[PDB]
Structures are given as structure tokens and as C-alpha cells.
């Protein structure tokens, strides 16, 4: 289920909470390459 | 676990711990017409009621416990059919 | 392991690898230099001592002073071993290096011979 | 007098994705093109006992902003950093890659991820085997400037570039302008 | 061919600082990339300097009635001493938890096999998976075996 | 012929007031090679000083010290079963024992490697940097 | 064989308590020349002994420098035992640290090296010194075998499965390399 | 044959953790160090006239 | 700790052969947590002396894998030792020498019996019979586990073998 | 490839070793030291 | 060889690294733990830019026989493909070896006047360059 | 006049780990500590000949 | 592995090996010094025929 109170990991939830609050693309480039563009939705485990 | 919580006492409802049925989880699912693939899990298929509603299978006397969504269950297990062959030759 | 080269044997060769694994190389310092990384402080005098007894003992059991034939000096006897020709009793171009000379400083070799004949101090 | 020349360049590159049970299938290459029944069956089982997380579906990662310390202006904030990110690296600003390559981005280089049964330094060399159809496909562009904001909308408008369709294969796929609201700091940030 | 050396034109202007970290955010945009095996760049891209704070720094969040962790992630007071991965992060509270009522876990062992991959995150234009992001290994309480 | 040589002794640098030392240094100019001579001694000397400079040599720490690592390490991991304050401190004068899990897990199998300092230089891996004890999900 | 004369004799040591002497290898057996059994080195009694750390401890009779911190801990520090003598009312914590055995091959990393005879010298570092420390590096060999009739059961052996660091050690590096290469030469004319 | 007593020793056992098998064996303090480095070799040569 | 009578005039000799193991009834961590992964275990029996030399081959990860024991005699005939943190008392009560075989084994104070036959399949007299006496030692039907009757090893290899001995 | 191995962002614990060398570094630029310390503990560390 | 699920299934108790991703070593000192952060972050900094200087292994001697010099402490090894023996290399069976040209050390960098590094072949990039 | 000299020689190192000696606050043997304090400070080629 | 035999053997001299601060140990060690050294060049293939 995507929409709830997701429990967040201890990375994602503190290097979230260290963002600043005005806009700055230095951290928010090297979040978004450790973590990725994408969260999971749906989808089996195929194998190939 | 909370209604068994401080349960001084407690009245076994079912004399032996006896296995659920397989893929019964499959039986709870609910199902997106829109989208081709049917859900995820709506009803729970854990709960029992309480009442150790069994089902004894064909060659496998380990009894199956039956949930209480579950109004009844029956063993029809039966193949039911496609063929097709064509050869040609030269010479 | 040295009888045969087959694929049978390498299985528990490596096994007794796993078992014992002997030293495949390692690096090297003069042994002057632990003292100086030691608890004990500074060592200079005693450093500088043990490099000059160092020095001279690399000199004085050095393997060209060693009886010509690979020369291995050990304690006071002179061996080879073999060159594996078992022709004589010391197993007799050729090739072989001169002892260093006496520090001038100049300090030479003579005899193709590998390396540096000429050291400088 | 009698000339003679023979040349086998056989090769294969198998992709098998259980971590141990990987390497039976595809170390029986030698001599062996067809895999073992039971070797198959017991990867299957492996891999079975162990994910194969990829053949996912997405959704935007910053959606899961909800209960933090300034959540929605750090929610908007990662939403204009994830549109930087996707377009300052998109693969439109590498060149079209030979032989239908396929262009990435890594870091500042480019990469021509080469097709099957090719390779070279812009897979242009061994073109022996296509076993497809052939020709050059279409590339979208990189967006040009983004909209003033006149009234809301977008006019990046993606057009075709330097790699056309020329052998014959199919345009690229895709829309041809974009249209939103424009955020003017979203309301001015939420009343 | 013809080799391809990248170049990057003058960075973006100045931004603000309010992270009590005071940096100016001086991000560039490499107009020309590499190819052809070339010289793939060599100045970095970010720049940091001193910068003037302008707006205060932003303060944590209420942790309203929630028991707080070793890390900060409050959660509600319903799996105080429950005998499991309260905290989900760490086992930091413990509650002491000697006396642990209910049974808990109810005798449930395993989770599924490699559920932290589930929770992993996902990279579309690399390939590649990122790291764990939501914390699937979570249970409420609510045992669902 | 081209045996290992050092630079010259670099200039002395100020006493450094809180490690109460000065330090001088060579770098290298030319590899030995061909079994040739090395550069056998150190190519770093220490000497005393007399430190007389404020210096903020130690750092606060809000929990409790650890007694022989001196580590800040909060009272929430004391009294746990593990060993967390270093070689023998923690767990000192402990009424009850908690915290610990039952089975008695082992460690990540290859964590220790993944712990140590890599020389990307020359794809040597060199001494422990991480600390990759126990300190249990 | 050629040996000088024997050396002026030095002066008495006050703990040693013993003369000693030495002389010079001029020359050795090239070919057939006379062997010397003599050595170039000798000793001799003495009798003119005078007077035979300062840190927080010392052993008795080794001038080895110890920490208090290391006093009544368990584990002996000292040959001579002076660390966990009258050691009476102290406790001694376990750290499940020496159930375990120390890393194997400590024996040749602690021997020194002589390039001239390529042998091994006598013990130069402490193998044995841990100096309270105890660091655990994960074996790469816990897969040799095991098992069980009664249970049926076939599994690795998981009984020692852990490699406790010397002081003297930075780190054991377990990793895995190999690479083996055959050359080969065919030449005819 | 031994011209020397090679039982006796000084003070804290000292390990000989090494050999194929799992067994702990003693060092006297009158033998310095022993390894356990089993080198192997040998050679073949042949020659005609 | 305890001990029936074994067969009585049990001989080595005509026990010797391929046996086939078919159910093991006790309560160990392996039989509940990974029973579901039992394979087709085959036991071969080869006198020495008074005591029996044992190999067992069994399907690891596929590749077959030799079990070579060696039953240490107690000194009565038809009990047997072997020796690894525990004393195994291999004990064999009831069995015949053309069908089935029934073992007896005690580790750590506690018992397990062992059902072996020459070949598939398996009289139901012989299962009822195992059962019966699995039952009377203080055992549950619950902790019977029944084995795969196919995929036996043929022979190990000189590189797959246990040395217990 | 069979495993995948991340370390966290920040707030890390360091080595008791590291530590105390860290702690005898000197403030004063020494590249004696600091050659040391590189060749004792490498230059980088492992992130992913 | 067929008996590689030994390997397959053994790795896992003994995995290698494979890729890298690699951070500064200044980055990992902390404020929290040491003061002077700044200081000591600029300092490993320029020990790290004068031990890539010093450590860049060109220094070395060119080896012989396609040898790949390796740089260690004081002392330099030349490793040589299989079929070279002796120290450099020099004596093979084979004749017209081609040898794979190396590159040198760069030079160093232009005080300010726009920094260029030179570098020759006696096959990796060069003209490096950097904004003053 | 036929001549045929083949040499076909292998030299293959698998190596079990890596170890690396640390270079400061080295903890040297008994022996070997004794010995040094048994050398005394003037010069002599016997005691470090010894040593 | 049961039974190993000596292949390789360092040498060392006896008188070496006298306990020292003996009675007469300095003397008694340069005699058996002059013994072994008697012993060595008295008779040898060297004085045969
Ligand atoms: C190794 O042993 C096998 C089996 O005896 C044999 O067939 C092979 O020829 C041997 N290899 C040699 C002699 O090089």
C-alpha cells in the first residue's frame, strides 16, 4: 500500500530531515543519486 | 494479539493445532476489473472464528483448518483440452 | 603434488591450502629500523651502531667472499649445492661477480655480469 | 598449388539472473549449447529461494514526503531537483550511437551501450550477424527552455534532431509539446 | 572518429542559505559531453562557499506523545514492550522490556526472504537499484501470519 | 643505477601545541629498482617541545565516557550484553541483562573486509577504518 | 680457513655478568683450503657484577612496559607472571574473546629474516601480546564439513568460526586472489 | 640423538596453532620457534650422446 | 538414557549391502525447521571385524556426497558407538535380512529410530510396525518424517567424501 | 556479483585504532604524519 | 570444469568486492568527534594531492617484455606477462614483441596563468585542465 | 643439421590473504627486548653481531 | 606425516652450546674449541693415501 504512514528508514528519514529548508541543489543531487527517481508500486518477482 | 492479552483463563476451542489450506490467501484477494491483475489483499484469511472447522483431503489425513470466509469447500481436482498436428512430405 | 599434473590432485591441494598456507612472499626492512618505531623512545646512538654492525656484517658474510661455483655462505663452509650437473664434487661463457673493493669513496667490481659494478659513498 | 583458409568465430554471452547456482548453467557453455534438465530445474529452484527484484513498476519517489519537518516545500523542492537532475543528464545531448546503439550517461560520458553481437568504441564493428530488421531509429531532442509562465502552460516543445529516420525504421515515440499549471510558487506556497 | 572532450560553460548564479551550513549553491550544467572514450571532464561540478544566512534555520519536528528513538523516528506507544523490532531502526527504547506480555511474535519466525531488496529503491535511466527506503520490515503489532 | 634517493630534510615546522611535537619530512624523488639500494630509515623525525598555546585537545561528550576507548557512547547501549564501550569497559557493574537476542546471531558474512581503508591508488586494501562491531532486528 | 686473533676483552656488565670477545673472518674454504672449526665468536665467565620502565608497570625480570589498565585482566601479559599474581578480589569478563584461537601463521609473521641464508631467525615480534584488545576478523575456511546421523543432517561446521587479532597485527585481510599462468615454447629448425 | 633436554619450559604456554588437522601442540622454551612450512620439490633431467 | 534389547543373533555379514533409509521419527531442530528439504538417503553396510564399516551418499545441492563411519563396537553384540560434540549408540532390535532394517540411535539423552528397506516399496505391515513401536517410544506422530522413494547416488568421487574415520 | 553492500550516509561509527591515530594527528600541516596515515589506512573508504 | 557449483555455492561464505564506489577520507572526519574539522579536512586534502603526486607509480622505470610497473614503498616491481623472466624483462622467446606504450608523468600544473598538465607515450588522456 | 630446444615452464601463486604489519606502537618479544637492553652504548662488533 | 626425517641441517658448534658461567666454562670451551679442532684435521681422507 503507497498511500500511508510508510515507515521510513533511518538514511532516508535523516538525510530528508538535514535538507535545507530554502532550495538547494547541492544535497538534493547527491539524495537523489544515493536513493534513485523512483519508489516501488507494483510488480511480481519474475525471474529471467 | 490483543483480546488474548491477561486471559487468565482460556477455553480451547480446538483440541490439536491443525494446518490452513493452501492457497487460501489467493481466495481473499480482491479483484481490479480494470487493470488484469486482480489486487491486493482485502480480506484476511488468517481469522477463524474461533469454531476449528476442518476438511479432510484425499490421501492426506493431515487435516486442513478452514477459515471462517470460507462457506464450503469441496475437492473436484480434474483435467478438462486442445490437439493439433499437421505433417507434410516432398519428394 | 609433483608426480602427476592432473586435475585430481589440485582439489585437495588446495584443501591443505585452506589447512596450512605457507608465507608466498613479504616485504622487508633492516632490522635498525623497528627501534626506531619502538616504546622505548629515541634510539639513535644504539640505531646507529646497529646500522654500522649491519654494514659490516653484510660485508663480511657477504655470498661473492663465499668459494665460487647459486654461492651460498653459510657459517664457515662454502656450498652450492649443484649446478644439477653432478659432474664434480662442487657440480662444475660462465659468468661471476667480483667481491666489492675496499671504500676509497670508491668502491668496484669486475667480472654478461647483471647490475652495478661502481658504488659511491 | 593448393590455398586453404578456415575461420569458426563462435561466441555466446549468456545472462543468467539464486547467486550460486548462477555459475553451473553458464559455465556448461563448453561444448554443451543446450542446458542440463536437472541443472535447470535446480536453478529454478534457486532462484526461487532468492529475488530477482528487477521487472518493477515505478511511481516518483518524492511522494513519500508526508510527515516531516517542512514536508511540503522540501516535497516541492525534491519535485523541481528530480526535474534538474532527469533533464541535465538526459541522454538526448549524446550523439547518436552506430548500428542502433543505445546512449547513457555517466556522470559527463557518454556510453553507446552496444546492441547484441556488436561492439567497437560507437558500436560500429561487428555488424556480421543483425537478425533484426535493420535501419535507424528516431531520438527525441533535449527540451528547450522552459515556459515564462504565461499562463501556466509549457513550451518545451521536443522536435526531432540530427538523428532522423533514415534507414527506414520508425519515429521516435512520444508527445510533441507539454501542457501543466505553472507552480508561481505553488500558490504562493499553500495560502 | 572524431574524439569529443567535454566543456563546461560558467555556473548558475548564487542561491540562498538557510541550513545553518551556510553554502552558496553554485551548480553548472556541462553543455558538451564526452565521447568516443575521450577526456570524460576533469573540474568538479558543485561548488562550496561561505554565504550570508538569511532566514532562520528550520527546528525539528514535535514529537508529539511518541516515544522517541535513537535516531528520531517517533512512533506511537501501542508497541511499547512488545518483544520485537519496535523502532523498526534500532532497539534503542527497549522498554525494559523483561516481563514481555502477549507472546509476542505469537511463535512467527521468518519474514520473507530478502523483503530489505523489496524495500530497496529503484533508478530508471541506470539500471541499477539504490538503497533501502521504506522500511518493510515493520510489523505494528499487527502479526499477520 | 637508479637507486632509491630522498629529498631534503624539509624546513621545521612551529611546535604544534597540542600534540606537544614538531615534525619534519622528505618525499620521495626517484624508486629503487634492480635490487638496488633502498631507502632503508624513516622519512619522518619527531622531537619534544614546550607547548605553551591554548588548545582544545578534548571534545565534550553528552553520554556516558567510555573507560578505556573513550568513546561517547550513550547510556541506552550499557548493561546490553554487548561490548560497546571498547575492549572491557562497557558492561561494568551491571544489575540485569538485557537487550540481547536469543538465537545468538553471527555477523554479515565478509563485513570485516568491507570495513577497512582501500587505497584506490594501487588497489591495495589497507587498516580497519569502520567499525563494524555488533552494537538487534 | 683464516681467522684473526681474539679481541680485546670488553668490560664486565653488571647483569650479564660475563666477557666477551670476538675476531674477523678473513678467509673462507673457496676450494680446498683447511675449514676452521673455530667460530668468530666467545664468551666467558665474569665476576665483577656492580649494581644489577618507570612507567605505570613492568614485569619482574623482562624490561616489557605496561599499562595498569592491563593488570589482573586474564590474560598474562608477562612470561614471569607478575600481571595476575595476588590478582585475589577481581573480577576477569570473558568477552567470549578467549574461547577463540588466534589467527594461524603468527609464528612466521613474528620470526625476523636473514637475506643472506634465506632462514628464519628467532622470535622477534609477540605473537602472544594482545594487549587487552580484542579484534575478530570473519574466516574465509568455515565450510569444510559436518555432520550428523542422528538428526540427518549434513551442514558446515559451525563450531570455530572466528580469528582473534594480536596486538602486533594491524589487520589479517581476508580476501581471495588467484592467478596462474603456463608458458609454453615450441621451436623447431 | 638430542645431546640436550628439550621438555622443559619457562613460563606461559606459547601456541603452535598450525598443521593440516585441528591439534594444539607445544613449543619448549629451549627451541626459539618451529614452522610448519612444508615445502615439496624435485627435479627430472635426461641427455643423450 | 535408555536401552532395549537389540536383534538377537544380529550378524554383520548378512546385514551387509545397499540399504535404502525410508523414515526417521525424533525431534531435532533439522527433521522440524528443514525436514522439507529431505532428500533420498541409501545407506551401504560392509563388515569389519566385530564392528561395521558405513557409507551413506546423499544428494547436497545436487552433487552426491560419500558418509564413510565407522560403527566403534561397545563390546556386546548388536550395540554400537560412534564418535563432533556428542556419543552416538547405534542400536538395531527388529529386523529382518531381505526387507527392512530398524536402528536405534541415542545422542544426548535423547532417542530416534530409523526405518531401512532393500527396495521400494515398503510393506505397509513394516510402516505399521514402525509406527507402532515409534509410538511406544515416547514419540509423536507428528515427529514421523517420510523421504523422497527416488534420486538415490549411484557413487561418490574421490573428491566428495567424508573422513570421519 | 552476489551481494550488495551499502554504508549508511553519515553518523557512522569510527575504529578505536582510527580514533586514536586521528587524535594524535597534528593541526599544524605535516605530510609526514599524513603519508603515514594514508599508507596505514589507504586514502578512500567504502561507501557502496 | 563441471563440479563449479562448488564455487557458485562457496562464494557466498567468501565474497570478493567487485565494484568500487569510493569517498574522500576527509569526508569521514566528523565535527562531532574530532575539532579543528576545517583544519584537518583542508590538511588531508593536500597530504592526498601530494600523495597522488607522489604515489602516481610513473616514477618508476620503464619495464620491459609489456611489464606493468608497480609502486611499493621504496622499491618498484616490474610485472611481466606470462613467457618473460628475469628482472625487467628483457629476455623472452620471441622476437618484434609489440609493446603497449605507457604513458609518463605530467607535468605540473601553471600558477595561474591557465593550468595546463603535459603527457607523453614513451595511452591515456592528457591536456588537462583547470580554471584558476 | 636439426635442432629443437622447447622449455615450457609455469609459475602459478594463489595466495590465501593479505597480512600488513603496523608500523607504530610495535610490541617487540622478551627476548628480543632483553637483548637490546643487554647492548651497550659504545661500539662492539660481538654483542651486535649476536643480535 | 607419521615420520619425518632430517633433509636439511644448520650447523652450529658444540662448544657454543656449554653452559656458560660454568667452573671452568670459558676454559673448558676453548679447549673442547682446540678438541674438535684436532678432532677435524687429525684424520680425514686428506692424510690417507
Ligand atoms: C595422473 O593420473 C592419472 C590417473 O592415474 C593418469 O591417467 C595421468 O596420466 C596422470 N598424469 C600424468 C602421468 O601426467
Redesign the pocket.
Known amino acids: 500500500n503507497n498511500p500511508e504512514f510508510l515507515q521510513l528508514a533511518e538514511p532516508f528519514w535523516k538525510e530528508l530531515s538535514h535538507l535545507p529548508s530554502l532550495y538547494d541543489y547541492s544535497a538534493y543531487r547527491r539524495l537523489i543519486d544515493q536513493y534513485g527517481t523512483h519508489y516501488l508500486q507494483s510488480g511480481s518477482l519474475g525471474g529471467e | 494479539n490483543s483480546d488474548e492479552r491477561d486471559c487468565g483463563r482460556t477455553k480451547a476451542v480446538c483440541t490439536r493445532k491443525y494446518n490452513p489450506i493452501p492457497s487460501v490467501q489467493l481466495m481473499g484477494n480482491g479483484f481490479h476489473f480494470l487493470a488484469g491483475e486482480p489486487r491486493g489483499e482485502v480480506l484476511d484469511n488468517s481469522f477463524t472464528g474461533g469454531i476449528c472447522k476442518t476438511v479432510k483431503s484425499s490421501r492426506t489425513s493431515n487435516p486442513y483448518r478452514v477459515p471462517a470466509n470460507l462457506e464450503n469447500v469441496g475437492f473436484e481436482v480434474q483435467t478438462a483440452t486442445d490437439f493439433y498436428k499437421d505433417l507434410t512430405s516432398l519428394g | 603434488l609433483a608426480?602427476?599434473?592432473?586435475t585430481?590432485?589440485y582439489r585437495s591441494w588446495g584443501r591443505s591450502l585452506k589447512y596450512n598456507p605457507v608465507v608466498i612472499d613479504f616485504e622487508m626492512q633492516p632490522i635498525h629500523e623497528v627501534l626506531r618505531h619502538t616504546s622505548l623512545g629515541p634510539l639513535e646512538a644504539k640505531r646507529q651502531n646497529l646500522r654500522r654492525a649491519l654494514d659490516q656484517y653484510l660485508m663480511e658474510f657477504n655470498a661473492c667472499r663465499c668459494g665460487p661455483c647459486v654461492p651460498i655462505l653459510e657459517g664457515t663452509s662454502c656450498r652450492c649445492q649443484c649446478r644439477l650437473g653432478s659432474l664434480g664434487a662442487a657440480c662444475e661463457a660462465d659468468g661471476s661477480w667480483s667481491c666489492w673493493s675496499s671504500w676509497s669513496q670508491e668502491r668496484r667490481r669486475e667480472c654478461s655480469c647483471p647490475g652495478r659494478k661502481v658504488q659511491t659513498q | 598449388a593448393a590455398s586453404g583458409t578456415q575461420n569458426n568465430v563462435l561466441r555466446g554471452e549468456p545472462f543468467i539472473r539464486g547467486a550460486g547456482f548462477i555459475s553451473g548453467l553458464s559455465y556448461l557453455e563448453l561444448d554443451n549449447p543446450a542446458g542440463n534438465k536437472r541443472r535447470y530445474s535446480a536453478w529454478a529452484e534457486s532462484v526461487t529461494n532468492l529475488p530477482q527484484v528487477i521487472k518493477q513498476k515505478l511511481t516518483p519517489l518524492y511522494e513519500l514526503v508526508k510527515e516531516v519537518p517542512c514536508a511540503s516545500v522540501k516535497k516541492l523542492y525534491l519535485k523541481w531537483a528530480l526535474e534538474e537532475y532527469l533533464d541535465e543528464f538526459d541522454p538526448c545531448h549524446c550523439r547518436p550511437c552506430q548500428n542502433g546503439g543505445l546512449a547513457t550517461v555517466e556522470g559527463t560520458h557518454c556510453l553507446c551501450h552496444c546492441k547484441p553481437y556488436t561492439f567497437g568504441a560507437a558500436c560500429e564493428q561487428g555488424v556480421l550477424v543483425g537478425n533484426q530488421a535493420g535501419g535507424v531509429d528516431g531520438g527525441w531532442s533535449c527540451w528547450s527552455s522552459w515556459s515564462p509562465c504565461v499562463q501556466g502552460k509549457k513550451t518545451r516543445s521536443r522536435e526531432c534532431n540530427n538523428p532522423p529516420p533514415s534507414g527506414g525504421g520508425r519515429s521516435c515515440v512520444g508527445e510533441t509539446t507539454e501542457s501543466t499549471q505553472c507552480e508561481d510558487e505553488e500558490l504562493e506556497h499553500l495560502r | 572518429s572524431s574524439p569529443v572532450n567535454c566543456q563546461w560553460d560558467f555556473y548558475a548564479p548564487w542561491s540562498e542559505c538557510n541550513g545553518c551550513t551556510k553554502t552558496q549553491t553554485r551548480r553548472r550544467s556541462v553543455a558538451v559531453y564526452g565521447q568516443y572514450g575521450g577526456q570524460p571532464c576533469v573540474g568538479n561540478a558543485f561548488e562550496t562557499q561561505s554565504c550570508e544566512p538569511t532566514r532562520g534555520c528550520p527546528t525539528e519536528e514535535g514529537c508529539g506523545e511518541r516515544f522517541r528513538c535513537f535516531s528520531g523516528q517517533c512512533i506511537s506507544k501501542s508497541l511499547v514492550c512488545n518483544g520485537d523490532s519496535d523502532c523498526d531502526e534500532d532497539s534503542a527504547d527497549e522498554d525494559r522490556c523483561e516481563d514481555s506480555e502477549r507472546r509476542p511474535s505469537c511463535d512467527i519466525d521468518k519474514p520473507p526472504p530478502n523483503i530489505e531488496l523489496t524495500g530497496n529503491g529503484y533508478n530508471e535511466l541506470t539500471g541499477q537499484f539504490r538503497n533501502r527506503v521504506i522500511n518493510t520490515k515493520s510489523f505494528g503489532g499487527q502479526c499477520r501470519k | 643505477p637508479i637507486d632509491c634517493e630522498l629529498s631534503s630534510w624539509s624546513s621545521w615546522t612551529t611546535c604544534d601545541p597540542c600534540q606537544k611535537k614538531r615534525y619534519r619530512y622528505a618525499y620521495l624523488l626517484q624508486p629503487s629498482q634492480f635490487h638496488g639500494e633502498p631507502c632503508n630509515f624513516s622519512d619522518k623525525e619527531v622531537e619534544d617541545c614546550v607547548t605553551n598555546r591554548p588548545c582544545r585537545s578534548q571534545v565534550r561528550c553528552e553520554g556516558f565516557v567510555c573507560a578505556q576507548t573513550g568513546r561517547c557512547v550513550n547510556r541506552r547501549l550499557l548493561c546490553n550484553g554487548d561490548n560497546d564501550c571498547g575492549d572491557q569497559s562497557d558492561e561494568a557493574n551491571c544489575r540485569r541483562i538485557y537487550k540481547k537476542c536469543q538465537h545468538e546471531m553471527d555477523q554479515y558474512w565478509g563485513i570485516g573486509s568491507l570495513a577497512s581503508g582501500i587505497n584506490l591508488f594501487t588497489n591495495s586494501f589497507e587498516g580497519p577504518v569502520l567499525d563494524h562491531r555488533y552494537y538487534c532486528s | 680457513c683464516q681467522l684473526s686473533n681474539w679481541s680485546e676483552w670488553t668490560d664486565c656488565f653488571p647483569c650479564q655478568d660475563k666477557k666477551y670477545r670476538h675476531r674477523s673472518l678473513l678467509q673462507p674454504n673457496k676450494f680446498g683450503g683447511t675449514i676452521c672449526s673455530g667460530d668468530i665468536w666467545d664468551q666467558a665467565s665474569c665476576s665483577s657484577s656492580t649494581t644489577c620502565c618507570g612507567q605505570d608497570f613492568q614485569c619482574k625480570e623482562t624490561g616489557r612496559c605496561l599499562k595498569r589498565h592491563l593488570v589482573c585482566n586474564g590474560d598474562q601479559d608477562c612470561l614471569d607472571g607478575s600481571d595476575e599474581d595476588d590478582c585475589e578480589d577481581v573480577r576477569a569478563i570473558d568477552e567470549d574473546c578467549s574461547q577463540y584461537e588466534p589467527i594461524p601463521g603468527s609464528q612466521k609473521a613474528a620470526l625476523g629474516y636473514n637475506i643472506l641464508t634465506q632462514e628464519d631467525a628467532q622470535s622477534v615480534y609477540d605473537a602472544s601480546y594482545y594487549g587487552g584488545q580484542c579484534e575478530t576478523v570473519y574466516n574465509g575456511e568455515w565450510r569444510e564439513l559436518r555432520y550428523d546421523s542422528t538428526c540427518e543432517r549434513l551442514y558446515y561446521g559451525d563450531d570455530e568460526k572466528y580469528f582473534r587479532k594480536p596486538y602486533n597485527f594491524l589487520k589479517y585481510h581476508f580476501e581471495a586472489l588467484a592467478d596462474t599462468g603456463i608458458s609454453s615454447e615450441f621451436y623447431d629448425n | 640423538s638430542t645431546p640436550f633436554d628439550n621438555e622443559f619450559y619457562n613460563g606461559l604456554c606459547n601456541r603452535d596453532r598450525d598443521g593440516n588437522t585441528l591439534t594444539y601442540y607445544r613449543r619448549p622454551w629451549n627451541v626459539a620457534s618451529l614452522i610448519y612450512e612444508t615445502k615439496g620439490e624435485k627435479n627430472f633431467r635426461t641427455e643423450h650422446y | 538414557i535408555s536401552t532395549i534389547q537389540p536383534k538377537a543373533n544380529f550378524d554383520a555379514q548378512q546385514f551387509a549391502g545397499t540399504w535404502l533409509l525410508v523414515a526417521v521419527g525424533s525431534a531435532c531442530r533439522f527433521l522440524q525447521e528443514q525436514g522439507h528439504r529431505a532428500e533420498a538417503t541409501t545407506l551401504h553396510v560392509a563388515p569389519q571385524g566385530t564392528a561395521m564399516a558405513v557409507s551413506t551418499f546423499r544428494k547436497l545441492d545436487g552433487i552426491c556426497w560419500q558418509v564413510r563411519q565407522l560403527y566403534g563396537d561397545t563390546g556386546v553384540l548388536g550395540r554400537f558407538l560412534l564418535q563432533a560434540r556428542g556419543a552416538v549408540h547405534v542400536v538395531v532390535a527388529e529386523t529382518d535380512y531381505q526387507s527392512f532394517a530398524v536402528l536405534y540411535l541415542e545422542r544426548a539423552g535423547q532417542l530416534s529410530v530409523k526405518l531401512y528397506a532393500r527396495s521400494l516399496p515398503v510393506s505397509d505391515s513394516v510402516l505399521s510396525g514402525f509406527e507402532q513401536r515409534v509410538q511406544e517410544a515416547h514419540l509423536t506422530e507428528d515427529q514421523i518424517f517420510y523421504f523422497p522413494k527416488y534420486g538415490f547416488c549411484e557413487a561418490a568421487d574421490q573428491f566428495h567424501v567424508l573422513d570421519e574415520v | 556479483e552476489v551481494a550488495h553492500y551499502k554504508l549508511k550516509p553519515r553518523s557512522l561509527m569510527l575504529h578505536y585504532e582510527f580514533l586514536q591515530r586521528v587524535k594524535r594527528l597534528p593541526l599544524e600541516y605535516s605530510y609526514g604524519e599524513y603519508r603515514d596515515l594514508f599508507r596505514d589506512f589507504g586514502t578512500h573508504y567504502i561507501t557502496e | 570444469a563441471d563440479l563449479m557449483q562448488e564455487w557458485g555455492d562457496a562464494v557466498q561464505y567468501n565474497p570478493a568486492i567487485i565494484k568500487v564506489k569510493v569517498e574522500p577520507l576527509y569526508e569521514l572526519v566528523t565535527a562531532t568527534d574530532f575539532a579543528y574539522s576545517s583544519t584537518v579536512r583542508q590538511n588531508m586534502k593536500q597530504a592526498l594531492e601530494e600523495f597522488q603526486k607522489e604515489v602516481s607509480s610513473c616514477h618508476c622505470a620503464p619495464c620491459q617484455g609489456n611489464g606493468v610497473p608497480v609502486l611499493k614503498g621504496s622499491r618498484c616491481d616490474c610485472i611481466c606477462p606470462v613467457g618473460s623472466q628475469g628482472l625487467a624483462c628483457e629476455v623472452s622467446y620471441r622476437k618484434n614483441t609489440p609493446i603497449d606504450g605507457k604513458w609518463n608523468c605530467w607535468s605540473n600544473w601553471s600558477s595561474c596563468s591557465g593550468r595546463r598538465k603535459t603527457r607523453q607515450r614513451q595511452s591515456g588522456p592528457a591536456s588537462e585542465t583547470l580554471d584558476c | 643439421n636439426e635442432k629443437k630446444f622447447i622449455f615450457t615452464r609455469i609459475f602459478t601463486k594463489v595466495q590465501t590473504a593479505h597480512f600488513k604489519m603496523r608500523k607504530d606502537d610495535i610490541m617487540l618479544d622478551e627476548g628480543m627486548l632483553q637483548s637490546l637492553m643487554e647492548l651497550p652504548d659504545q661500539y662492539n662488533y660481538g654483542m651486535y653481531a649476536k643480535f | 606425516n607419521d615420520a619425518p626425517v632430517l633433509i636439511s641441517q644448520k650447523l652450529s658448534p658444540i662448544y657454543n652450546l656449554v653452559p656458560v658461567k660454568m667452573k671452568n666454562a670459558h676454559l673448558k670451551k676453548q679447549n673442547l674449541e682446540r678438541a674438535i679442532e684436532d678432532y677435524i684435521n687429525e684424520f680425514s681422507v686428506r692424510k690417507c693415501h
Request: proline share 0%; net charge positive.
Open positions: 608426480q602427476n599434473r592432473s585430481i590432485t
